[PDB]
Amino acid sequence: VLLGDVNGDGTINSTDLTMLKRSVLRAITLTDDAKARADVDKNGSINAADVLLLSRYLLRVI
Amino acid sequence: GVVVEIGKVTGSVGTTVEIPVYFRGVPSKGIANCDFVFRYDPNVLEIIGIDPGDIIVDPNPTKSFDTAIYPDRKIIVFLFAEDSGTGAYAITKDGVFAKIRATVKSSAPGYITFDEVGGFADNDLVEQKVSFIDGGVNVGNATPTKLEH
Ligand SMILES: [Ca+2]
Ligand SMILES: [Ca+2]
């Protein structure tokens, strides 16, 4: 539902970014609900491109 | 919790100044990430760049640290997210987080102010209590109200 809100706490911030990058490096595992929130470009995969898109959003360029 | 202090500096019109952003009360499990927004007046300050401070330990700082400058929006944005994925590049000590480089455009005070904060988390993703102290350039510049020393 709320794209970018990886941890599902209702706000999009850099803590979601940490969670996203650690999951992409397989340092953590996401819950299924979190996976839907993590796929920020909605292409069906969670990867480095999602990390970069979320970073751009947090830097407010988009 | 964490205290973020914007330094206070002085400088003549036309000169470049550096405004440091200090971190205190760094958590026992470090800072894995932080995002926040400061406000500034582009009539007073032309922000030419923001450099990472020495508490950014990633040997390639741009992997962990990025900023954005918006003169039209009158804001500057900070994004830190330690890039190791293991907590290795987290912030572990108090010190300078960033240095804001600005050319002084007028003698009026050039306040740099806390606008918004997202999250400040440690290596366990525990969000921290955070407070800000505003600062900027020539903070006391004013028309005198009386005759005084
Ligand atoms: Ca969140
Ligand atoms: Ca994706």
UniProtKB/Swiss-Prot annotation, chain A:
Q: Where are the transmembrane segments?
A: none
Residue span(s) of domain Dockerin: 1-62
Note the superkingdom of the native organism: Bacteria
The family annotation for this protein states: Belongs to the glycosyl hydrolase 10 (cellulase F) family.
- Name under which the protein is recorded: Endo-1,4-beta-xylanase Y
> What species was this sequence derived from?
Acetivibrio thermocellus
What is the name of the gene encoding this protein? xynY
Q: Which residues of the full protein are shown?
A: 730 to 791 of 1077
Swiss-Prot record, chain B:
Q: What's the superkingdom here?
A: Bacteria
Q: Cellular location of this protein?
A: Secreted
Q: Where in the numbering of this chain does the Cohesin domain appear? A: 1-140
The record describes the protein's role as: Acts as a scaffolding protein in the cellulosome. It promotes binding of cellulose to the catalytic domains of the cellulolytic enzymes.
Q: What is this protein called?
A: Cellulosomal-scaffolding protein A
**What is the recorded post-translational modification?**
O-glycosylated on most but not all Thr residues of the linker units. The reducing sugar is galactopyranose.
Q: Which part of the entire sequence is included in the shown chain?
A: 183 to 328 of 1853
What is written about domains in the entry's comments?
The cohesin domains bind to the dockerin domain born by the catalytic components of the cellulosome.
